[PDB]
Design an enzyme around this catalytic site. Structure first.
Site, PDB file in Angstrom:
ATOM      1  CG  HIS A 142      -1.523   1.326   1.532  1.00 31.10           C
ATOM      2  ND1 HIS A 142      -2.906   1.450   1.508  1.00 31.10           N
ATOM      3  CD2 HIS A 142      -1.039   2.536   1.850  1.00 31.10           C
ATOM      4  CE1 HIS A 142      -3.222   2.712   1.770  1.00 31.10           C
ATOM      5  NE2 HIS A 142      -2.085   3.451   1.958  1.00 31.10           N
ATOM      6  CD  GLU A 143       1.934   3.920   3.563  1.00 28.99           C
ATOM      7  OE1 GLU A 143       2.301   4.913   2.971  1.00 28.99           O
ATOM      8  OE2 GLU A 143       0.841   3.898   4.188  1.00 28.99           O
ATOM      9  CG  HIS A 146       0.795   6.353  -0.895  1.00 29.90           C
ATOM     10  ND1 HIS A 146      -0.376   6.852  -1.413  1.00 29.90           N
ATOM     11  CD2 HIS A 146       0.540   5.856   0.335  1.00 29.90           C
ATOM     12  CE1 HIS A 146      -1.343   6.666  -0.525  1.00 29.90           C
ATOM     13  NE2 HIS A 146      -0.833   6.069   0.560  1.00 29.90           N
ATOM     14  CE1 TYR A 157      -2.915  10.217   1.068  1.00 30.92           C
ATOM     15  CE2 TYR A 157      -2.827  11.428   3.122  1.00 30.92           C
ATOM     16  CZ  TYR A 157      -2.963  10.239   2.451  1.00 30.92           C
ATOM     17  OH  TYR A 157      -3.101   9.016   3.064  1.00 30.92           O
ATOM     18  CD  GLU A 166      -4.390   6.826   1.981  1.00 29.67           C
ATOM     19  OE1 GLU A 166      -4.127   5.682   2.437  1.00 29.67           O
ATOM     20  OE2 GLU A 166      -3.256   7.251   1.883  1.00 29.67           O
ATOM     21  CG  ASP A 226      -8.422  11.012   7.410  1.00 31.09           C
ATOM     22  OD1 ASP A 226      -7.191  10.939   7.418  1.00 31.09           O
ATOM     23  OD2 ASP A 226      -9.152  10.216   6.795  1.00 31.09           O
ATOM     24  CG  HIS A 231      -6.522   7.462   6.094  1.00 30.48           C
ATOM     25  ND1 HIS A 231      -5.972   8.673   6.479  1.00 30.48           N
ATOM     26  CD2 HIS A 231      -5.536   6.708   5.539  1.00 30.48           C
ATOM     27  CE1 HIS A 231      -4.674   8.627   6.163  1.00 30.48           C
ATOM     28  NE2 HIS A 231      -4.386   7.465   5.590  1.00 30.48           N
TER      29      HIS A 231
HETATM   30 ZN    ZN Z   1      -1.920   5.442   2.100  1.00 33.40          ZN
END
Ligand code: ZN
Ligand code: CA
Ligand code: CA
Ligand code: CA
Ligand code: CA
Length: 316
Positions: A142-143, A146, A157, A166, A226, A231
């Site tokens: 997932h990271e 990005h 973002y 996300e 957020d 998220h």
């Molecule tokens: Zn993320």
């Protein structure tokens, strides 16, 4: 470092033994010369200064409990590199074999992991909410995804574009977990989240509302927390992506699934050819429909399923 390529052995966060690509030059370093311009793993030694020191070991055996998070960050960056290369023909995150750097043991009791625009950073968790976050292949992928988004669509973002950013990371982190066939599922972070509770996870793609995230556009978060719900509102897209793949009926709308492989090909194309920094959910639908059209024809079942899925989550 300049040295000889070799293979070491260690144990990951979950106790599993794996071989890792190392480099020898007096010490054995976590430097994998077999993928692109290299995969490099650093020790941040409980500090927040980055990247820290390139991980050095005296005997190429990584069975110490302090070594575990490094073993898995290094190995799961390699698996993520292999997925993108073998499945999508992309060499590293910039498409030109950029070196992938990760630092583990960042800060103390840090319950998070993140791509900071130049490298991966992983906390060890506090031992209650999380265990070292590089033990989760869907977290690592997932990271790392990005980084691909940053070099291609460039989704900002915040608000709907951040929630798409996300969701794209959850989608591809899940597809990487299925590619490595590591007990795969549609949940995120279940291998590293709350060691004391079985069966939960941070987020769910198959049923986002199980953890309170929206699974329909009418339930979207509209406040400021957020960064506008990046998220939170990603649950709406994640549910759409799960239905495209697996199929199902959601709020009375029925979707015929087309599987994971076509899901990945459609979203990868949408990400690298049609999304832009300020794309919103409606533009995401259009991009996913255009991608499916490109690949399978405007009167295919694949285009029909992408349309039904977005209809089911209220995105028009
Ligand atoms: Zn993320
Ligand atoms: Ca050792
Ligand atoms: Ca799993
Ligand atoms: Ca998972
Ligand atoms: Ca748990």
């Amino acid at each position: 470092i300049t040295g000889t390529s070799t293979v070491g052995v260690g144990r990951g966060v979950l106790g599993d033994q794996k071989n890792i690509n190392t480099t020898y030059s007096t010490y054995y370093y976590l430097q994998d010369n077999t993928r692109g311009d290299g995969i490099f793993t650093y020790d941040a030694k409980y500090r927040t200064t980055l990247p820290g020191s390139l991980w050095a070991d005296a005997d190429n055996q990584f069975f110490a409990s302090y070594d575990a998070p490094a073993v898995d960050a290094h190995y799961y960056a390699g698996v993520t590199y292999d997925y993108y290369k073998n499945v999508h023909n992309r060499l590293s995150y910039d498409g030109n074999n950029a070196a992938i750097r990760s630092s583990v043991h960042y800060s103390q009791g840090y319950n998070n992991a993140f791509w900071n625009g130049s490298e991966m950073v992983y906390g060890d968790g506090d031992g209650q909410t999380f265990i070292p976050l590089s033990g989760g292949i869907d977290v690592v992928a997932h990271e790392l995804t990005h980084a691909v988004t940053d070099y291609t669509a460039g989704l900002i973002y915040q608000n709907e574009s951040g929630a798409i950013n996300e969701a794209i990371s959850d989608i591809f982190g899940t597809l990487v977990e299925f590619y490595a066939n590591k007990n795969p599922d549609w949940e995120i972070g279940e291998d590293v989240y709350t060691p004391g509770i079985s069966g939960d996870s941070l987020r769910s793609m198959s049923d986002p509302a199980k953890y309170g995230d929206p699974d329909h556009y009418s339930k979207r978060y509209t406040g400021t927390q957020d960064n506008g719900g990046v998220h939170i509102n990603s649950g709406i897209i994640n549910k759409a992506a799960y239905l495209i793949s697996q199929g199902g009926t959601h709020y009375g709308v029925s979707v015929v699934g087309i599987g994971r492989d076509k899901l990945g090909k459609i979203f990868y194309r949408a990400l690298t050819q049609y999304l832009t920094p300020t794309s919103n959910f409606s533009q995401l639908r259009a991009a996913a429909v255009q991608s499916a059209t490109d690949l399978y024809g405007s009167t295919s079942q694949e285009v029909a399923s992408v349309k039904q899925a977005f209809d089911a989550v209220g995105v028009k």
